[PDB]
Design a binder for this molecule. Structure first.
Ligand SMILES: Cc1cnc(NC(=O)c2cc(Oc3cnc(C(=O)N(C)C)nc3)c3cc(C)oc3c2)cn1
Ligand SMILES: OC[C@H]1O[C@H](O)[C@H](O)[C@@H](O)[C@@H]1O
Ligand code: NA
Length: 448
């Protein structure tokens, strides 16, 4: 054992972990670069080259007028596929979750939308309604270049999705064609929204100050209410339109280069979309645990962890799940949670190993919270400027397992947003069934 040696080991761990550190000035730099990229995406002259796409959603600030009745909602791209029946009068919901097979997410668009339509049929039978033709709202968690609220092309798949025959095509069309091939129900697709947009809309229902939507789950993204005069891609300068930032692609033109560590390059190189969604790759739950796994292998290689031996499970891709980062950070101090996770990964951890794993986890999750804060602060700061407000009071609607379930992420992120947003009063609100509800609310408003 030896307490002097255990300590020397932790000091070398720290020297390696220090590379994850971001100073307040680094965050301001990241923030200013994000803001610079947001200006670029919005303008007709730089839009095509901008990494931050600032996509117009065609979701407009509207005086009101919501339709009443039953609305169907689809949710694709997060954790599984969701069908929701929404009753607008007051709003009450009925919903079901379906696990997407790998062969559908990685095969053809036809296989993907065929399975989606099968699930819709199953929801409609379970609620005895495959006869009623309802207005349908679609939450599709991928970058889309809209022509309208109900017409838009998939730019590229993100988060490991790889279905062929989808990119370059109208997503509403793919969906509608799949419903027709099946021929056992009818739906009128009225709106297609990003998950950030759906979250902002359902959160707004509860707090009219909500004009920003943020997702920190499998992926990381944000939307906000932009002035129509700043939305150059849409003719008109009156009122506001929701803009899908698609901020996950920040750094794809080299904007984050000085901050990318070896672990970031490896995660990127072994991903389905290399060289893409690099800022998301620093924060998203699809990558967080993999980043911790990589740091642990580096520490095993320096003979600082697990007697310099890594098990087959520790050398398995995606074995250190993001939920384990959350669970390791939940540990009360006894080390029991850390121990069980490590034992299940075929390791024989000492008390010191448990503490080192704890440290690698906090170094990755604190970096994610800090990188994510520079992005939110850039959006909020830009809004304060555009609205020419001395003190801007805004509510941010947030969804996703990383922000929701990670034990300290949310706190580190809020504190870092606050530091970067002086003269801003930000209220953070967590969405209760965010996406589904949101896509149906936009549908009720659109269905006039
Ligand atoms: C074509 C088109 C263009 N823009 C929109 N625009 C919209 O649908 C719409 C709905 C919104 O949120 C709502 C949430 N719930 C309700 C509600 O209480 N209902 C009963 C639905 N209403 C609005 C918000 C909130 C902001 C900041 O912008 C919005 C736009 C919709 N369709
Ligand atoms: O789901 C979270 C986010 O993940 C990825 O960044 C997607 O490209 C974006 O559309 C989505 O909002
Ligand atoms: Na405009």
């Amino acid at each position: 054992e030896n307490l002097y040696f255990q300590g020397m080991k932790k000091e070398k761990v720290e020297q390696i972990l220090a590379e994850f550190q971001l100073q307040e000035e680094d965050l301001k730099k990241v923030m200013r670069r994000m803001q610079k990229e947001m200006d670029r995406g919005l303008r007709l002259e730089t839009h095509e080259e901008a990494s931050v796409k600032m996509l117009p959603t065609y979701v407009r600030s509207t005086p009101e007028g919501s339709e009443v009745g039953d609305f169907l909602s689809l949710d694709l791209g997060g954790t599984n596929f969701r069908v929701m029946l929404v009753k607008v009068g007051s709003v009450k919901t009925k919903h079901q979750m379906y696990s997407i097979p790998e062969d559908a997410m990685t095969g053809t668009a036809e296989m993907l939308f065929d399975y989606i339509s099968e699930c819709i049929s199953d929801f409609l039978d379970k609620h005895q309604m495959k006869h009623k033709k309802l207005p349908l709202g679609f939450t599709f968690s991928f970058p889309v270049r809209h022509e309208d609220i109900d017409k838009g092309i998939l730019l590229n798949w993100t988060k490991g999705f790889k279905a062929s025959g989808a990119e370059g095509n109208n997503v509403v069309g793919l969906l509608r064609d799949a419903i027709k091939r099946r021929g056992d129900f009818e739906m009128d697709v009225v709106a297609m929204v990003n998950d950030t947009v759906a979250t902002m809309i359902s959160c707004y229902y509860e707090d009219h100050q909500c004009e920003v939507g943020m997702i920190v789950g499998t992926g990381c993204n944000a939307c906000y209410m932009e002035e129509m005069q700043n939305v150059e891609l849409v003719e008109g300068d009156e009122g506001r339109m929701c803009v899908n930032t698609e901020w996950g692609a920040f750094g794809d033109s080299g904007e984050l280069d000085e901050f990318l560590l070896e672990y970031d390059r490896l995660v990127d190189e072994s991903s389905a979309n290399p060289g893409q969604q690099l800022y998301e790759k620093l924060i998203g739950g699809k990558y967080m645990g993999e980043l911790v796994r990589l740091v642990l292998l580096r520490l095993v290689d320096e003979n600082l962890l697990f007697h310099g031996e890594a098990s087959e499970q520790l050398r398995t891709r995606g074995a250190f799940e993001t939920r384990f980062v959350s669970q390791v950070e939940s540990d009360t101090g006894d080390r029991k949670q850390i121990y069980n996770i490590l034992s299940t990964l075929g390791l024989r951890p000492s008390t010191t190993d448990c503490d080192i794993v704890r440290r690698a986890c906090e170094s990755v999750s604190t970096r994610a919270a800090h990188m994510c804060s520079a992005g939110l602060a850039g959006v909020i700061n830009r809004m304060r400027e555009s609205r020419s407000e001395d003190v801007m009071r805004i509510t941010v609607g947030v969804d996703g397992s990383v922000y929701k379930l990670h034990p300290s992420f949310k706190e580190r992120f809020h504190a870092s947003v606050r530091r970067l947003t002086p003269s801003c009063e930000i209220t953070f609100i967590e969405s209760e069934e965010g996406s589904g509800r949101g896509a149906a609310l936009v549908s009720a408003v659109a269905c006039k």
